Design an enzyme around this catalytic site. Structure first.
Site, short mmCIF file in Angstrom:
data_model
loop_
_atom_site.label_atom_id
_atom_site.label_comp_id
_atom_site.label_asym_id
_atom_site.label_seq_id
_atom_site.Cartn_x
_atom_site.Cartn_y
_atom_site.Cartn_z
CD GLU A 1 -5.03 -4.75 -4.22
OE1 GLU A 1 -5.20 -4.09 -3.22
OE2 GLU A 1 -4.02 -5.28 -4.50
CG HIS B 1 -5.31 -3.08 -0.20
ND1 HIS B 1 -4.46 -2.80 -1.13
CD2 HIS B 1 -5.16 -1.98 0.73
CE1 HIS B 1 -3.54 -1.95 -0.78
NE2 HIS B 1 -3.79 -1.38 0.25
CB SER C 1 -1.01 -0.11 1.07
OG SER C 1 -1.90 0.90 0.98
#
Length: 566
Positions: A347, A467, A214
Site C-alpha cells: 500500500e 495503493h 480509498s
C-alpha cells in the site's frame, strides 16, 4: 507532474474522445425513473462486448448559489425525455496532471450501466463510490469505465458527490445549517435513488452491493455506519480503507476561516460573516486554495486534508456523522451485512512521489513519534509516553541502524491502512450479529496494463503493488488497451470482477467457476482468530495468514495502557 506526462495525458485525452465516439452506437433506449424518462445509449468495449449506458442522471438539485455547502435536495421531476447519452462534469477539483482547477458545482449525478436492459431475472446491483481523498475524482468513463464489469450479468452504478470544501465545509453555529458532510449526504441521497429506481434497469433492489476504494472505501464504510441508510443495501466491500483510517475524518470547523482569509476575506472570525464571504466566492478560487489551508502543525501531525468527513457539531434532519466513527461502529446497522475488506501487498509504495520531494520525511522514523496515533500522542510529540509508543512503531518497521525509504513506505502501509483495518475488525466483532467478513490481499504486479494513479504516484518502472493498482482490473480507463485473453492481466480482470460479482450476488466471495480457485477454502474471520486469514491474489490465488499480522499486533501494543481507546 512533468511536462512530458502532461503532453502524454493531453494526447490520451484526445485519443479517448475519438475512441468514445467510435464505440458509441445508434441504439438509444428509454427507461423509466421516478423523476421521469431518461434516454440512454448502447456502447461498445474494446473486447467486442456491449452495454447500455445512462449518464448524467441527477439524484439531487444542483447545489449552486444558496444550496452551496448545504445538504442535498431531491431534484425536480420532468415530463419528457432527459438526454442521458453524455456524461456531466465532475465536482470542482484540482486536476492532478495539469494542476488547473476543473469541474463544476453542478456535479450531483450517477451513471447506470448494464449488458441487458430487459433481463429475465432481476440482477445484483453494484454501486461504486470513487476515492480521491474526498478532494478529487469522478464517474467519467475515461477513469471508471464499466467495460470489464458488463461481461457479468450485473447492474453497475458509478456516483459522484461533492468534493473538497464545497463538499465538506463545517461551521459550528447552528443557525447557519452547515454542519458538514454534505458530500456524504450526497452519497446517501444517491443511495436512496438507487434503491427506488434500479428495478427499472433490471436491478434487484433487495440485492445491492456498495463498494469503493480509498476515500471511496471510507465512504462505503460511512454508508454502512449511518442511520440515514439503514437497510438500503445488503453487501459492502471496503477496498484499501475505512472510516477509522486517520485520513478519513477530521475536525475542520476552524478551517473555514482560514480558507476565507486565504481567499480575501476582510473581517473577524465568526461563522456567519465567514459563510457569507464563502457563499459568494468563485468555486475555482476556493478549490485552488484548499492546498494551503492546513497549518504546519497539522501537516506534521499527519493531517492529510483540510476538509473532509467530520463529527457534525449539532444534529439536523440529514445528519450523517453525529459521533466519531469509532463510536458509530458500536451501533452500526452495516455491521450486520456481509462485508469484504482488503488491501494491496505494498500500500505505502504509493508515497514514493511525496518522498522524492521531501527526503527529510524518512528521518521521521528515527523516533516515529509523528506516526503515533494522534489520540495517544501529546501536542509536541515530546512526552516520554509518546517516545515509547513511537519506539514500538520503530521496532516494527526500521530494519537497520538507519531508517530507509522502504521502511517508511512499509510504515505508511500500516499507519494509513492495515492498523485501521485491524481496529475496525476487532471493534466490529464486539457489536455484530455474526455476518461474515472476508479478507483479501491484492498482490498482482503488472506494468503492461496501468491506471492514471501510477502517473500521480510517479509509479513508472516501480515494482510492487501500490495503493490503487487493483483499479486497473475492475475498470476501463483511457490508458488501458485490449489484452490477449490468455495474458496474466486479462485473467486477473476475470478473477477480480468475478469475485466481486460473486460476493455481490451471494454474500460469499468463493466460486469454483473462477479460474484458479480450485483449492481455495475462503473462510470468514472469527473473533476468536488471533491471526487473520486472507485470500492473497497474485498470479495464483492462495489462502494465507495475513503477512502484516506481526506488525499489526505491534501497533496494537501502543494501546496496552489505553485499551479503551482501541
Amino acid at each position: 507532474v512533468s511536462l512530458m506526462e502532461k503532453l502524454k495525458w493531453k494526447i490520451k485525452c484526445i485519443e479517448n474522445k475519438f475512441l468514445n465516439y467510435r464505440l458509441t452506437t445508434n441504439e438509444t433506449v428509454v427507461a423509466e425513473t421516478e423523476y421521469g424518462k431518461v434516454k440512454g445509449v448502447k456502447r461498445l468495449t474494446v473486447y467486442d462486448d456491449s452495454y447500455y449506458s445512462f449518464e448524467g442522471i441527477p439524484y439531487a438539485q444542483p447545489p449552486v448559489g444558496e444550496l452551496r455547502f448545504k445538504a442535498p435536495q431531491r431534484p425536480t421531476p420532468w415530463d419528457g425525455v432527459r438526454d442521458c447519452c453524455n456524461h456531466k462534469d465532475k465536482s470542482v477539483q484540482v486536476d492532478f496532471i495539469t494542476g488547473k482547477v476543473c469541474g463544476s458545482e453542478d456535479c450531483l449525478y450517477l451513471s447506470v450501466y448494464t449488458n441487458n436492459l430487459n433481463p429475465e431475472t432481476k440482477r445484483p446491483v453494484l454501486v461504486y463510490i470513487h476515492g480521491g481523498g474526498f478532494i478529487i475524482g469522478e464517474n467519467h468513463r475515461d477513469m471508471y469505465g464499466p467495460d470489464y464489469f458488463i461481461k457479468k450479468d450485473v447492474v453497475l452504478i458509478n456516483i459522484q458527490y461533492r468534493l473538497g470544501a464545497l463538499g465538506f465545509l463545517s461551521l459550528n453555529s447552528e443557525d447557519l445549517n452547515v454542519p458538514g458532510n454534505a458530500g456524504l449526504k450526497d452519497q446517501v441521497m444517491a443511495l436512496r435513488w438507487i434503491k427506488n429506481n434500479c428495478a427499472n434497469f433490471g436491478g434487484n433492489p433487495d440485492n445491492i452491493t456498495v463498494f469503493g476504494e480509498s476515500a471511496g472505501a471510507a465512504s462505503t464504510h460511512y454508508m454502512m455506519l449511518t442511520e440515514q441508510t439503514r437497510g438500503l443495501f445488503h453487501r459492502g466491500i471496503l477496498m484499501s480503507g475505512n472510516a477509522i483510517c486517520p485520513w478519513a475524518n477530521t475536525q475542520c470547523q476552524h478551517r473555514a476561516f482560514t480558507l476565507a482569509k486565504l481567499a480575501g476575506y476582510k473581517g473577524e472570525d465568526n461563522d456567519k460573516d465567514v459563510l457569507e464571504f464563502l457563499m459568494k466566492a468563485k468555486p475555482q478560487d476556493l478549490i485552488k486554495l484548499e492546498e494551503k489551508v492546513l497549518t504546519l502543525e497539522e501537516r506534521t501531525n499527519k493531517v492529510m486534508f483540510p476538509f473532509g468527513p467530520t463529527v457534525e457539531p449539532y444534529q439536523t434532519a440529514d445528519c450523517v456523522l453525529p459521533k466519531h466513527p469509532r463510536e458509530m461502529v458500536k451501533t452500526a446497522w452495516g455491521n450486520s451485512i456481509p462485508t469484504m475488506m482488503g488491501n494491496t501487498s505494498y500500500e505505502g509504495l504509493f508515497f514514493t512521489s511525496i518522498l522524492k520531494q521531501m527526503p527529510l520525511l524518512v528521518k521521521e522514523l528515527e523516533t516515529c513519534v509523528n506516526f503515533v496515533p494522534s489520540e495517544l500522542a501529546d501536542a509536541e510529540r515530546t512526552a516520554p509516553e509518546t517516545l515509547e509508543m513511537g519506539a514500538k512503531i520503530k521496532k516494527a518497521h526500521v530494519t537497520g541502524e538507519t531508517p530507509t525509504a522502504d521502511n517508511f513506505m512499509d510504515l505508511c502501509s500500516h499507519f494509513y491502512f492495515w492498523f485501521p483495518m485491524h481496529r475496525l475488525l476487532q471493534l466490529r466483532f464486539n457489536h455484530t450479529s455474526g455476518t461474515p467478513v472476508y479478507l483479501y490481499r491484492f498482490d498482482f504486479d503488472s506494468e503492461d496494463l496501468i491506471n492514471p494513479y501510477r502517473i500521480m504516484r510517479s509509479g513508472r518502472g516501480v515494482k510492487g503493488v501500490s495503493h490503487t493498482d487493483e483499479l486497473t482490473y475492475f475498470f476501463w480507463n483511457q490508458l488501458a488497451k485490449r489484452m490477449p485473453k490468455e495474458s496474466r492481466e486479462y485473467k486477473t480482470i476475470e478473477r477480480m470482477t468475478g469475485i466481486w460479482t460473486q460476493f455481490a450476488t451471494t454474500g460469499n466471495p468463493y466460486s469454483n467457476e473462477i479460474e484458479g480457485m480450485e483449492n481455495v477454502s475462503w473462510d470468514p474471520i472469527e473473533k476468536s482468530d488471533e491471526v487473520y486469514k486472507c485470500l492473497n491474489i497474485s498470479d495464483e490465488l492462495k489462502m494465507i495468514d495475513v503477512p502484516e499480522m506481526g506488525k499489526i499486533k505491534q501497533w496494537e501494543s501502543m494501546f496496552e495502557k489505553h485499551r479503551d481507546l482501541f
